[PDB]
Structure 1
């Protein structure tokens, strides 16, 4: 499970994998971890699936009522605070890491990270899930703030493809969504079109010389690939 959100000028870009696994078996290979709360606020949920689904739908049911009552759009701080409160008074029973990202006309685009513990940190870019730790040292190197909308979604897809290539718990479709002043737009690039994969990476084409032929010299010359040879 890998989820991430990156903020740019206009709004935010959410990206995530699509695979729920039972430890070592792919239960669902086309899952959807980007849950909408409002029209312009989404959440990427990681950890357990039942707990985060209950939380997402409870908070979205709250947000629908607040917005109808006040009659004007909802900030992202509201939704992030609701999530933090809930995931804080259930912190012993649930294992739920949330990334709440959205756009409001007041403060532009915003990304909040609510980890397992239950805190709430408002960031410029957030990562989460079991396969995240492979992305930190990817963002420290290849990421610069102030990107455009298109280059942002390209970088997000690239980050997720580098995260689920090495991680076992992650994989499948790459699902991204862009939230900004215009309509929120979605995109799902499959695995057979991903911007990276360790099978098509030409540095992993030549194999490790492990099966040495029974030979007379100590020169290593590659594997033994047939019985005659």
Structure 2
């Protein structure tokens, strides 16, 4: 009746870089067509101890790519006996996506922290291209917050300011995007560690609706 629909994440993924780390965020809704298969999913897949990734697109393809890249990065880090660089994980993701761009669709953005370059945010959209961005948004609902993030993004934002900005933009996306919803999952990565928080119910920022009386 409502089957034969490949489970697509339909995420609104966001990653903002601050001084000495990166703030990650995403919703928790996966819709198989229009039915919400999962409403509390975890879209922030950790690649290493201090490197995370956000999955957008086909759930199976992104999951397989993330698992393969995690395996490769763990092996590489063991071989080098050093904490892996975020650029290395981004390059592995880019190579995997570019090799199989015609076989799998996966919009993945990688953010993390390494001793050398500190907090970094990399975006690898469908096609297999990699570029470093101060803030990167992807997924179906990212289109509805491009102007908001463009207008409300500043340079030198603090960790808490970046968390608030990510929460606001994500909440706007969930409100406007049908494929986006659930709860806001945040992950602030820094030298000390990764601390994850989930905003649900009243915690999710609320924006006043027009509510014109005649309507």
Superposition TM-score, scaled by structure 1 size: 0.87
The alignment of Structure 1 onto Structure 2 pairs a total of residues equal to 205
Structure 2 match to 1:193: 203
Matched, 1:70 2:77: no
Structure 1 match to 2:67: 57
**Distance (whole Å) between structure 2 residues aligned to residue 110 and residue 207 of structure 1:** 49
SS across alignment from 2:67: helix
8 Å CA contact 1:5–1:101 kept in 2: the answer is yes
1:120 to 130, 137, 152: 130
Deviations 1:54-89 (A, max 9, x none): 000110011111111111111111100100000111
Spell out the pairing of 1:132-147 with structure 2 (5 A cutoff).
132-147=142-157
Structure 2 match to 1:19: 29
**Distance (whole Å) between structure 2 residues aligned to residue 146 and residue 134 of structure 1:** 24
**Structure 1 stretches of 4+ moved >6 Å:** none
Deviations 1:116-151 (A, max 9, x none): 111001111101000001111001211112111111
Q: Which runs of 5+ in 1 are unaligned?
A: 209-229
**Distance (whole Å) between structure 1 residues aligned to residue 96 and residue 201 of structure 2:** 35
Structure 2 match to 1:10: 20
Deviations 1:155-179 (A, max 9, x none): 1101100111011000111000000
Q: Which runs of 5+ in 2 are unaligned?
A: 1-10
Name the larger-Rg structure: 1
**Distance (whole Å) between structure 1 residues aligned to residue 100 and residue 162 of structure 2:** 34
Matched, 1:203 2:213: no
Q: 1:204 to 1:62 in 2, by over 3 A?
A: same
Tell me by how many angstroms 1:207 deviates: 4.7
Structure 2 match to 1:45: 55
Q: Which moved more, 1:137-146 or 1:36-45?
A: 137-146
Superposition TM-score, scaled by structure 2 size: 0.92
8 Å CA contact 1:174–1:191 kept in 2: the answer is no
**Distance (whole Å) between structure 2 residues aligned to residue 88 and residue 135 of structure 1:** 27
SS across alignment from 1:203: coil
